[PDB]
Amino acid sequence: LTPAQALDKLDALYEQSVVALRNAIGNYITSGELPDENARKQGLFVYPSLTVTWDGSTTNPPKTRAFGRFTHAGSYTTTITRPTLFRSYLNEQLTLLYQDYGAHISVQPSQHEIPYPYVIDGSELTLDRSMSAGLTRYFPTTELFSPLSHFDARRVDFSLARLRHYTGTPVEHFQPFVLFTNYTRYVDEFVRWGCSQILDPDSPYIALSCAGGNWITAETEAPEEAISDLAWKKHQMPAWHLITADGQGITLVNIGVGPSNAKTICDHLAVLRPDVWLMIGHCGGLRESQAIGDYVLAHAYLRDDHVLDAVLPPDIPIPSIAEVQRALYDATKLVSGRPGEEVKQRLRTGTVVTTDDRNWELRYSASALRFNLSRAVAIDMESATIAAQGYRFRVPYGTLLCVSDKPLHGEIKLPGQANRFYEGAISEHLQIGIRAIDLLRAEGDRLHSRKLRTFNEPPFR
């Protein structure tokens, strides 16, 4: 079986099942009819199942590529969902295994049914008590030889649903290069630069999906509702997508503040298999030689975020991704206009502390030892969490923060208040983020190294 073929059979099998389930649900709602246990066992509501096998013998196996490789020989499977949405990805990946390793592809009904909530397309239903009880009782609901991908069908559906809700955007609009910001003024500056890019008939950016719904293209009456204030009341983490023809745009998510939030957003955004996400936000400068408006390139993190300690113990080393570091570095060199060791007067590379206690100042003395011990240089509340999640989900990551204040030196200024020197840098900052992406996008596959491959790393990127 071949790539293109596999995709079609996936498309087919999937549509078939979702349609079959929707039908079953309606038939129950209207007449109270139940599905026949036999057709289900036969794979009525089941997700398609994609399997790739390798005999383990190829003359020149790619050993440098970061993804799309085989560690050993055998069969790798996984359930599939939204084949259309993932068509690009699925093809790119299957092709690599098909050609480079000459793998045996095959598609067929899995043993996992699609939870009914994931097939109810229009507005969520509003059945009475009994009606609901009956649904969750007679229909597929959510429950609490080697993996072919990182997430299985159910995990992906679960996250796709959330991404929409939190983001206030369609999962189809997300771009491969992500930018995370903890300050509202960053979106403002992003949207503005965005629309600008659309009108420029040279900028590949041809559209702008906005948290809330607004779709903005070259010909759009009043490009004002782009930042419909109502967004920040309906969506905990609004997103904005500067889309391009080939879908190599830039997606920006304003994760807001709290490690709790940074973990949550990444847990879902991860299923879309991004190429890289960058933390572009404000932070506190801990060194006296730092001036508000300066930049910090995180090269390590003191994880006082707690949110990921369970799944990733604090003594597990979270490294810097060289490729992402250079991009962030050079981007600062170019955008800030000063080439050479000149940048060091505006950029400090060092260890960043991420914490879940915003009023950490109230306990400085207690923190001070660890702060010194780790040669901390700045402090924030998302960095380490974003990095850690990138590390966990194999998504290149990087952190470039802008000093918005110096807690340890009288100058405490809560973002939103008058802080000339910080505020005036918000635009340049966002630009360093964007340029870093440009640089990384041009890197092609170089972007991805083997730095995050686990021993059991799935063949799919």
| Contacting a second copy within 239-278 (CB under 8 A) | 256-261, 263-264, 267-268
Residue number with CB closer to a second copy (41 or 409)? 409
Among 166, 122, 153, CA closest to 25: 122
Shortest distance in whole angstroms from residue 276 CB to a second copy: 17
Please tell me whether residue 13 adopts helix, strand or coil conformation: helix
Please tell me whether residue 167 adopts helix, strand or coil conformation: helix
Among 179, 450, 456, CA closest to 321: 450
**Residue from 12, 37, 416, 442 that binds a second copy (CB under 8 A)?**
416
Residue 138 has phi, psi (to 5 degrees) of -110, 5
DSSP state of 417: B
Contact 379, 258 (CB under 8 A): no
Residue number with CB closer to a second copy (119 or 286)? 286
Can you read off the two tokens belonging to residue 213? 């719904």
DSSP state of 394: T
**Residue from 16, 58, 75, 184 that binds a second copy (CB under 8 A)?**
184
Q: Gaps after which residues in the chain, C–N over 2.5 Å?
A: 144
DSSP secondary structure string for all residues of 279-291: E--EEEE-STT--
**Residue from 112, 173, 282, 287 that binds a second copy (CB under 8 A)?**
287
Residue number with CB closer to a second copy (79 or 197)? 79
Q: Which stretch binds a second copy (CB under 8 A): 18-26, 193-201, 239-247, 310-318?
A: 310-318
Shortest distance in whole angstroms from residue 142 CB to a second copy: 5
Shortest distance in whole angstroms from residue 384 CB to a second copy: 9
Give the Cβ contact number of residue 445 at 10 Å: 12
Residue number with CB closer to a second copy (162 or 192)? 162
75 forms beta bridges with 53
Q: Which stretch binds a second copy (CB under 8 A): 1-9, 33-41, 88-96, 401-409?
A: 401-409
**Residue from 311, 337, 339, 442 that binds a second copy (CB under 8 A)?**
311
**Residue from 219, 317, 396, 432 that binds a second copy (CB under 8 A)?**
317
**Residue from 371, 397, 422, 460 that binds a second copy (CB under 8 A)?**
371
> Tokens 């503040």 label which residue?
257
| Contacting a second copy within 351-370 (CB under 8 A) | 351, 356-359, 361-366, 370
CA distances in angstroms from 437 to 184, 248, 440, listed in the order given: 20, 10, 5
| Contacting a second copy within 133-162 (CB under 8 A) | 136, 141-144, 155, 158, 161-162
Rule CB under 8 A: say whether 38 interacts with a second copy.
no
Rule CB under 8 A: say whether 35 interacts with a second copy.
no
**Residue from 12, 36, 224, 446 that binds a second copy (CB under 8 A)?**
446
325 forms beta bridges with none
> Tokens 């990384």 label which residue?
440
**Residue from 8, 374, 427, 438 that binds a second copy (CB under 8 A)?**
374
Shortest distance in whole angstroms from residue 427 CB to a second copy: 18
d(CA 43, CA 302): 49
CA distances in angstroms from 350 to 8, 301, 325, 353, 374, listed in the order given: 49, 9, 12, 10, 10
Three-state SS letters, 235-275: CCCCEEEEEECCCCCEEEEECCCCHHHHHHHHHHHHHHCCC
Shortest distance in whole angstroms from residue 410 CB to a second copy: 3
| Contacting a second copy within 63-122 (CB under 8 A) | 63-64, 69, 71-72, 115, 117
Rule CB under 8 A: say whether 202 interacts with a second copy.
no
Rule CB under 8 A: say whether 282 interacts with a second copy.
no
| Contacting a second copy within 323-342 (CB under 8 A) | 325, 341
Among 182, 237, 191, CA closest to 214: 191
> How big is the site for a second copy, counted in residues (CB under 8 A)?
117
Q: Which stretch binds a second copy (CB under 8 A): 94-102, 126-134, 212-220, 240-248?
A: 126-134
The residue type at 123: S
**Residue from 60, 121, 221, 310 that binds a second copy (CB under 8 A)?**
310
**Residue from 124, 202, 221, 246 that binds a second copy (CB under 8 A)?**
124
d(CA 215, CA 189): 18
Rule CB under 8 A: say whether 314 interacts with a second copy.
yes
